[PDB]
Amino acid sequence: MVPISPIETVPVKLKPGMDGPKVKQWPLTEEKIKALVEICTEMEKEGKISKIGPENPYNTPVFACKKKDSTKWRKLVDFRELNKRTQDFWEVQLGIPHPAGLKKKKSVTVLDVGDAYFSVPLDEDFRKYTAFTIPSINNETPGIRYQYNVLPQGWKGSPAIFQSSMTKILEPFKKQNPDIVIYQYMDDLYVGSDLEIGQHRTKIEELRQHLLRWGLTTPDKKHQKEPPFLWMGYELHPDKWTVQPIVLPEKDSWTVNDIQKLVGKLNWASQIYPGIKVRQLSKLLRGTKALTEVIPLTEEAELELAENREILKEPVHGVYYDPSKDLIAEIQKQGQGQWTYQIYQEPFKNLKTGKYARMRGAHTNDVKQLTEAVQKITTESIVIWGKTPKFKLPIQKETWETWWTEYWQATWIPEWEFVNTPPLVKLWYQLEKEPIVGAETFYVDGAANRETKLGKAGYVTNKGRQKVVPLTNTTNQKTELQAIYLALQDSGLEVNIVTDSQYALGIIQAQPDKSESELVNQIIEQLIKKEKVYLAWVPAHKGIGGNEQVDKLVS
Amino acid sequence: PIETVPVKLKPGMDGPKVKQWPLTEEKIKALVEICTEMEKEGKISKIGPENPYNTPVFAIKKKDSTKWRKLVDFRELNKRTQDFWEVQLGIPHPAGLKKKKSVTVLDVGDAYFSVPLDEDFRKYTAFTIPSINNETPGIRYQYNVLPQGWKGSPAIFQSSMTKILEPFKKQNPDIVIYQYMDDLYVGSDLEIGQHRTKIEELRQHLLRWPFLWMGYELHPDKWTVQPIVLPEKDSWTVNDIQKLVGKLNWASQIYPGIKVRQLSKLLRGTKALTEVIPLTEEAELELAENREILKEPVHGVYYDPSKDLIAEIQKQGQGQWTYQIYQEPFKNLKTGKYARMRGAHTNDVKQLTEAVQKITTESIVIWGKTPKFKLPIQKETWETWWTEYWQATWIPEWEFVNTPPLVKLWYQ
DNA sequence: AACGGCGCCCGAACAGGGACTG
DNA sequence: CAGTCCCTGTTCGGGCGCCG
Ligand SMILES: Cc1cn([C@H]2C=C[C@@H](COP(=O)(O)OP(=O)(O)OP(=O)(O)O)O2)c(=O)[nH]c1=O
Ligand SMILES: [Mg+2]
Ligand SMILES: [Mg+2]
Numbered sequence A: 001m002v003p004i005s006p007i008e009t010v011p012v013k014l015k016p017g018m019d020g021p022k023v024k025q026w027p028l029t030e031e032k033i034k035a036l037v038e039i040c041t042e043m044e045k046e047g048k049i050s051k052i053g054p055e056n057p058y059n060t061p062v063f064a065c066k067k068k069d070s071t072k073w074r075k076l077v078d079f080r081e082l083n084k085r086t087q088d089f090w091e092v093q094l095g096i097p098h099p100a101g102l103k104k105k106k107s108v109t110v111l112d113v114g115d116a117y118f119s120v121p122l123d124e125d126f127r128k129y130t131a132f133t134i135p136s137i138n139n140e141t142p143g144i145r146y147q148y149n150v151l152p153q154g155w156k157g158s159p160a161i162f163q164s165s166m167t168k169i170l171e172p173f174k175k176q177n178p179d180i181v182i183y184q185y186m187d188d189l190y191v192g193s194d195l196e197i198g199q200h201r202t203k204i205e206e207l208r209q210h211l212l213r214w215g216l217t218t219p220d221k222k223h224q225k226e227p228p229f230l231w232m233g234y235e236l237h238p239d240k241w242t243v244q245p246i247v248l249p250e251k252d253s254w255t256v257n258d259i260q261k262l263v264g265k266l267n268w269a270s271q272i273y274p275g276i277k278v279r280q281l282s283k284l285l286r287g288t289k290a291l292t293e294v295i296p297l298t299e300e301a302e303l304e305l306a307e308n309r310e311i312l313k314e315p316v317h318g319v320y321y322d323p324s325k326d327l328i329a330e331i332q333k334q335g336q337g338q339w340t341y342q343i344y345q346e347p348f349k350n351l352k353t354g355k356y357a358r359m360r361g362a363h364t365n366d367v368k369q370l371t372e373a374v375q376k377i378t379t380e381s382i383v384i385w386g387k388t389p390k391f392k393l394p395i396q397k398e399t400w401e402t403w404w405t406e407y408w409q410a411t412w413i414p415e416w417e418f419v420n421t422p423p424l425v426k427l428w429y430q431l432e433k434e435p436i437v438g439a440e441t442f443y444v445d446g447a448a449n450r451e452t453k454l455g456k457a458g459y460v461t462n463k464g465r466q467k468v469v470p471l472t473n474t475t476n477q478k479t480e481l482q483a484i485y486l487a488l489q490d491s492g493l494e495v496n497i498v499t500d501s502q503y504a505l506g507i508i509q510a511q512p513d514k515s516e517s518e519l520v521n522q523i524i525e526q527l528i529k530k531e532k533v534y535l536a537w538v539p540a541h542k543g544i545g546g547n548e549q550v551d552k553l554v555s
Numbered sequence B: 001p002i003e004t005v006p007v008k009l010k011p012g013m014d015g016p017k018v019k020q021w022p023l024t025e026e027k028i029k030a031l032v033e034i035c036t037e038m039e040k041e042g043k044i045s046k047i048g049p050e051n052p053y054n055t056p057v058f059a060i061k062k063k064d065s066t067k068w069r070k071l072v073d074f075r076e077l078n079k080r081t082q083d084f085w086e087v088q089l090g091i092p093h094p095a096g097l098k099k100k101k102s103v104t105v106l107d108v109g110d111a112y113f114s115v116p117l118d119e120d121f122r123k124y125t126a127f128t129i130p131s132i133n134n135e136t137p138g139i140r141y142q143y144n145v146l147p148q149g150w151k152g153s154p155a156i157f158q159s160s161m162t163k164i165l166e167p168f169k170k171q172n173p174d175i176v177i178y179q180y181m182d183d184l185y186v187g188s189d190l191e192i193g194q195h196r197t198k199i200e201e202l203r204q205h206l207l208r209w210p211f212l213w214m215g216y217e218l219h220p221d222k223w224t225v226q227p228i229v230l231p232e233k234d235s236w237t238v239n240d241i242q243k244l245v246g247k248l249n250w251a252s253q254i255y256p257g258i259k260v261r262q263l264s265k266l267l268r269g270t271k272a273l274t275e276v277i278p279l280t281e282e283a284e285l286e287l288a289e290n291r292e293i294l295k296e297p298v299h300g301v302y303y304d305p306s307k308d309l310i311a312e313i314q315k316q317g318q319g320q321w322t323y324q325i326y327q328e329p330f331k332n333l334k335t336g337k338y339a340r341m342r343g344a345h346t347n348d349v350k351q352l353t354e355a356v357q358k359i360t361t362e363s364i365v366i367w368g369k370t371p372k373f374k375l376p377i378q379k380e381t382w383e384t385w386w387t388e389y390w391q392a393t394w395i396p397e398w399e400f401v402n403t404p405p406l407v408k409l410w411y412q
Numbered sequence C: 001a002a003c004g005g006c007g008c009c010c011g012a013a014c015a016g017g018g019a020c021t022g
Numbered sequence D: 001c002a003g004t005c006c007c008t009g010t011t012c013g014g015g016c017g018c019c020g
Helices: A039-043 A078-085 A126-128 A158-177 A198-210 A256-268 A279-285 A299-311 A366-383 A396-407 A476-489 A502-509 A518-529 A547-554 B027-042 B075-079 B084-088 B109-114 B117-124 B151-171 B192-207 B238-251 B261-267 B283-291 B350-364 B379-389
Strands: A048-052 A107-114 A131-133 A145-148 A182-183 A188-193 A229-231 A232-237 A240-243 A329-334 A340-344 A349-356 A390-393 A416-418 A441-448 A455-463 A466-471 A494-499 A532-537 B044-045 B057-058 B069-072 B104-109 B127-129 B139-143 B176-180 B183-188 B216-218 B311-316 B319-326 B331-339 B372-376 B400-403
Touching: A048 A390, A078 B379, A107 A198, A107 A229, A126 A145, A158 A182, A158 A198, A158 A518, A188 A198, A198 B027, A256 A279, A256 A299, A329 A366, A340 A366, A349 A366, A366 A390, A366 A396, A366 B379, A441 A476, A441 A547, A455 A476, A455 A547, A466 A476, A466 A547, A476 A494, A476 A502, A476 A518, A476 A547, A476 B311, A502 A518, A502 A532, A532 B238, B027 B044, B027 B057, B027 B069, B027 B139, B057 B127, B075 B139, B084 B151, B109 B151, B117 B139, B151 B192, B183 B350, B238 B261, B261 B283, B311 B350, B319 B350, B331 B350, B350 B372, B350 B379, B379 B400
Parallel strands: A329 A390, A390 A416, A441 A494, A494 A532, B311 B372, B372 B400
Antiparallel strands: A048 A145, A107 A188, A131 A145, A182 A188, A229 A232, A232 A240, A329 A340, A340 A349, A441 A455, A455 A466, B044 B139, B057 B069, B104 B183, B104 B216, B127 B139, B176 B183, B311 B319, B319 B331
């Protein structure tokens, strides 16, 4: 006979055709034994845990760690076998609240529900599926087995149930206090209002008593009444916010697991620290698949790490969101596919920062990557503030106009303005739209053998110029690129090039300025040196123009 | 007082589990206000996380409409109940709708809210309203009645819709009425005044039983087709003929009678691209023969109702957008071109969105299906902006392609 | 040694189309 | 025509950060 709590239960079923968990216990140290027998005894008197008998043919081990630098302990469990057989839940946690999205509030209070999962009941017909024994001695007393009447920690349905139950309890209070903002993340409650300090504490206690009607306690241990508030890993001040102090390790010998933790902290620090790069550091995590393997720092990876430490020396901070002012986002190019940005409303009062350094595609240009960075910032801004910021981009209006009107794919950037901060983003060469009168016409082609990997590449021109170059260890695609490269090398400033390679033409028409292929980069270098280049395509094996002539030489 | 029609998923398929995407502030506030009214009216109910199913939701405004409309992306749930609204309770497609002079589209989705939904199927209509900056967890609802945007809604309501439209059809036997999704397609050969008058009579016929006041007018008899055309120049260069032979060779995949023998003979040698080449007597003959084949229809091209429709779109530049609708490759059922749509010369995504909506509307009128689109755009670009310009109560399937134009096939 | 959420940078596995070979 | 290859794309799961 256990009392039913005021919180409504969540009907939890299991996947059909499967039973409950039947896993043997794990032998642990005697320190964990004297740290769990007292918990099951206290939770039994409080109704959070009931005792069972032989009519419950289930079992589950119960390993446990401590709490982070605190006196108490955290009783954990191993429901990994129960989670495989428990029904799937739809998570209602859709993201993480960011302090840059918080608005200005005169009074701020951060609550913390003590015993979060232990204050929400479990489904009545589901309590039988949570069985676990507690041996008082490591190898003497068999120990009486108990069950769970609340939400156990470690079950995959516990977070979703608590977050949904907490919302239903706060709904009547929010309807009675519309002007009060309550950021609800797990059990921590961020309460803000523009009321006076005295009237704010009154509504806080009204909320504390409202939650107490459902057995939710908000003790004064983790009750925050004055800044700076530690909320979501940040330091909230009345007019600014900053990230809690980030410590970067400084080891004399760097391994693989050390760099993974280093880049992770730099990604977390790049939300308010402008100019953080992780290109050369993450480059060391390629190929090597041994977390305990020492890796020497590259000269480029050492200078990158040195510049990130100097940025973290000067303390930085972000401001809060003001809906009455516009949202501005400014992007800068850091080179080598690295982009950094700042989102603000007033000049030099950053809400947050960030970076975009993803390299997608074997061949690309700065205009494509700037477009991708704009999309990343747009979606991130809709999550945090629910609107798109006005962009300030280091690309000329005329440059952008040339790219998007001439590209074959649909592409677009939202309302933006040009900002003159080098290095400016531009297109490094422009293919002609019509053939060039007076320029030599190069008919290029390349063929390779699938078996021997041998091939040839060359050209013939209208002036009688001709070349055939034998190639070893190549493909048909590489020889077609090589044929175009030869024509660019051996021509003047203006040249017409006729190819039958859809592969090569598609790469070059997209005006790439960078590539994972040394050959494409060499082709790009030649295209920049030229004054006029016209690429034309013809179908192969049709006796068309000089393409039939050069096809005989290379094949 | 109405027995719920039992609905079951296709055998071997689970319900939709699609994550909600971020919504703008104005869309969230609109959905909160709409869902609060629907919850007060019993149309929807709040649910918990024990429902593992979820469908994305957002909001749109129709053309020249200032009123927000709730739109659920039931694309995943629809193809998981395909044997219901196509096999069990299907709607016949009238072949005369495309022949009518004027076709008006009427939103009748609100009528579905009066018919309850099967209790065992309500869990598959779950959707989640997000919050800005994740201030609060997701607010989950599920439908208690026939939801808008679900293909099972017009199928179950078809019996109710037929009895409502039965007196009007007897009064006007020459009017063709087709129902697709939340819409009603009404076509007639009457004059513009007589047509709109009969449309208003049909509106009053539905009133005696929040977007019924709107009427989007179509004219399928004015819908044009874009054939493959060849350039006509006074003088021809080596480059002009190389492009012409390249276009005719690709066109041979559609018309097997196109020849390029006499034209390729003009390019004998290794000539400069700008060298003018006069067309021979046989070249004029072969080029004139190829221009007539492009006017002749393609052999063995007809609609198969069992096959899906595919739509390809090409960005031609300067507000020009060509498209082709087919079921088998090179067997185009329709080819067309759009020009000077909204967003022309400034916004590719709005134009592409407009083009997709126009092509889908034509496909509903002509065949009664929505095609799967091959969109000439990056996935991340389309998924960032497309909802900002969507003005339709349905959503077609789409995929993303990247095909550089080796030869301008549909627009010189 | 647990659960859930989001972000990054990583690699392996898989899909898809031009082009050559039997 | 099949069956490969070459090349490029997406998907996914895990590494790390962070929250609870
Ligand atoms: C930090 C943490 C948390 N949780 C779950 C459990 C309760 C809520 C909040 O945890 P908590 O606030 O730190 O501890 P709690 O149970 O509330 O007890 P108190 O320390 O607040 O009194 O999230 C978890 O499952 N694993 C974790 O590592
Ligand atoms: Mg707590
Ligand atoms: Mg070739």
